[PDB]
Symmetry: C3
Subunit: 335 residues, 3 copies
């Protein structure tokens, strides 16, 4: 719980109302009750602000005349919402102190205030920095290092020789450092190439659930600082992702892809390997990225949904487009 | 457990034609069935084949009866009867039995009657497990989460905090329920995490496949309706709502704040955009690219299917240059007219 | 781990050019190699660059040899030799060693010789682990499952009941083998679960990536042939059959009752529908949308690639209205045919 005046100060927002209002948490506009603070971004909600029952609403200056409650005025309500949600965060920690059922190799090196959940397994040589939290059931493989403040939720798998920076967050089910898909061929028989590279994850990286990041074949798979990666993503061996790039859910990346900084990869996209995407590129959902992207901007692919009867004709015509092309060329020649 | 054919027929509401004393030990495919097995025929083309079936009994329709070469259970719907008898004779073990000494269970957790918790499972403070709930080995159930009576989790399932799961649900291994949604604000190019303080509410009789992820809501909740079935490797983003009885096949990816109606069927590997709605009774075929809202019931499709590589190369190049093709067509139209 | 260069050359069947007494400690890339490392060159464009590589030895061909600036191992196939020497100098640890006191092993489980079981692994009744099997930490192996000699599971792998795995397999973390297929009947509008009492049969020398799922069959079995390699995030549905030596790249989804032949290559993120067959020696390029059986060997492809969004918008609009284009072209043909 926190006073609205204190909250406005920490948020660097201008208060318009009773600063002694006690705020207990954040809520959506439709769900907000007394004691909740909420926010609005779309001006369509201005007009039924008298139905919102929050104790305070974060809004812009143009929204203030429509306010029917105490208001915190700011330039960017969505960013202010992020900050106040962090102040009022109710999320528990993956673990507290070191659980007696955890299995920790005697040669592990633990910083101060390290928490390890029940039945987590820490291999030899592992280094956990100050304030690191390992959730229940995690595995952290030999000689891996996790920087100060980083947190793993339950049932995360970190392989051997992995480096993770400070203040990272990895959600459950994720696997970091599995073998890359590297094989030689000896007369039709696959010959495993041991993957003795690593994964280097920078600082302030957040990784979703059931995402896989393979280790490099010789050199390393590299995730830059401030990268965010959603659920169900596959990052193949020797991929390099530049700082602050965002990767949405279900993206599949092939090996040796290089992605620049400040990129945004839409969900379910497929990016082929041995190529580079430059800085400040946006790929929209389900993009089929076959070629390098050398200029910033927005890129898209795919033929969107149609009613099935219409699709049947669309797909049949598209598959025979070569004949349409030949017929057009013939007609041009005749005319 | 072995059962007498006459007793099995009564439980199935089938007409017995043959020896009710036959002992049935399990269910098998028609090609694999041996003595002691019961099987079923749904395709009348196999009537001439029944003499090659070694099952002790065969479920079939009244129209099939003259072709039987074994004891027969006559029913209106052999496929449904097969589902029912497979449940009666199910050989699937339970994920756990009793409470394993290696399980770690917070003192404040509330266990109902006949709850089983497998080895090395972890149960946090405030958790409530209803009667007959089974938690598989290596599971994690987060703080204050509630799992309704008769629900079962296979091994290595992760339930985060404040999750509500209904009665008689089944969740396969590797699935994660309640992870943080992909919620971030942008501050001059830096991503600022938005804590996801909503929950997930899963209804009754929901089945979730393996390695599926269902994210918790940002403020309000991610909601899975009653009777929903979800296959493997699906991603259900924060604040998605899925209506009762909807089926989601494997590998479907949904964006945040999507609402899917009741009675829908989403084909495997489909991709659905966020902040929009799909109405009731919509079927999206496999690999559907669902970019816009769907406001009328029916079947919808997308995608250009496979061709020989030599042919695809021309197809792809021509489609990508279709604007030029369009211009040439109009130009020729003007010239002819 | 470390080996004299002469002995390494002998085991690789390589021709040594240089000091056989050099001590090699591991493998490294050309750019990263330092004293004690062996590296390899596959691209002759780097011949001029070999003076900058500080590896102690370089694997190369006879045509590269005049350009060497180090001890050299000459072979016909530098890439295959690199695979073999990386195995010889492999630094990858084992998932486990010995039997961990925190593992929970049913009294009726049967273990061969030199079995290792990692911390907090769970082994159900009736399980059989062959000689030299390694079960990583946190794994679950369900009732009556059998794992053949030399096979290894990394941490947090889930094997359901009645699963059969062959010899010298390798399964990466997070993978689930034997979960229920997606089988349901319809009772007047209510889903009715069909118990999935088939199994999964995995052959010998199969490698499966991370967070891959392989469902069990409804009555008969899901079958993975010998020498198959499967990447991360793959979905193999109930009753799929995959022939020997086929490779499945990451993110591939296979619907139920699909049969794939031998020596196939399925590109990443492909979607393969079920109740159909793909013959031997078929290559499906990435993101392929397979809706019909493939009856002839060769390479098959689908998908419209990326364009700038403003260009894509026009392309998508024209394609979605291609029926109108077709009709206009036919009408124009009639006019040109004087009809
Ligand atoms: C629930 C049910 C008993 C019936 C059903 O509707 C269904 C089932 N299994 C499916 N597998 N795949 C699939 C999986 C992977 C790749 C490609 C396709 C579908 O698309 C499936 C569908 C659907 C078809 C159209 C909409 S949902 C079993
Ligand atoms: C098995 C092998 C040694 C050789 C191989 O053929 C192959 C390999 N790795 C791949 N990654 N991806 C991929 C992954 C993610 C997104 C897009 C593509 C492919 O498509 C891959 C392929 C194939 C190409 C064509 C058919 S399979 C390594
Ligand atoms: O693409 C993001 N999500 C997302 C997830 C899953 C599926 C989709 N489907 C589509 O787009 C889609 C379906 C059909 C056509 O298109 C999108 C996305 C990107 C960047 C972000 C972000 C979300 O939130 C944080 C800010 O950065
Ligand atoms: Mg334990
Ligand atoms: Mg996918």
């Amino acid at each position: 719980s926190i006073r609205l005046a204190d909250l406005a100060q920490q948020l660097d927002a201008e208060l318009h109302g009773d600063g002694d209002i006690v705020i207990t948490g954040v809520a959506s506009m439709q769900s907000a009750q007394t004691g909740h603070i909420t926010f609005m971004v779309n001006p369509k909600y201005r007009e039924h602000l008298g139905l919102c029952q929050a104790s305070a609403v974060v809004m812009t200056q143009d929204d203030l005349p429509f306010a029917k409650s105490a208001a915190l005025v700011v330039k960017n309500p969505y960013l202010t919402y992020a900050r106040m949600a962090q102040i009022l965060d109710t999320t528990p920690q993956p673990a507290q102190n070191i659980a007696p059922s955890a299995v920790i190799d005697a040669t592990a090196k633990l910083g101060n205030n390290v928490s390890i959940g029940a039945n987590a397994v820490i291999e030899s040589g592992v280094e956990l920095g100050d304030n690191v939290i390992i959730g229940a059931g995690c595995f952290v493989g030999k000689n891996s290092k996790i920087g100060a403040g980083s947190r793993l939720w339950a049932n995360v798998t970190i392989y051997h020789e992995i480096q993770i920076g400070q203040n990272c967050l990895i959600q459950s089910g994720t696997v970091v450092g599995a073998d890359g898909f590297g094989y030689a061929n000896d007369r039709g028989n696959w010959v495993k190439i041991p993957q003795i590279g690593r994964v280097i994850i920078g600082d302030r990286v957040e990784i979703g659930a059931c995402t896989t990041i393979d280790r490099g074949a010789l050199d390393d798979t590299i995730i830059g600082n401030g990268v965010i990666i959603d659920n169900q993503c596959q990052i193949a061996h020797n991929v390099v992702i530049g700082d602050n790039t965002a990767v949405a859910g279900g993206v599949i990346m092939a090996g040796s892809l290089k992605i620049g900084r400040y990129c945004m990869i839409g969900g379910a996209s497929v990016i082929n390997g041995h190529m580079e995407i430059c800085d400040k590129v946006t790929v929209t959902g389900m993009g089929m990225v076959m070629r390098p992207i050398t200029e910033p901007g927005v890129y898209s692919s795919g033929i969107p949904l149609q009613p099935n009867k219409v699709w049947r004709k669309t797909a049949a015509l598209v598959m025979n487009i070569d004949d349409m092309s030949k017929r057009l060329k013939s007609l041009e020649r005749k005319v």
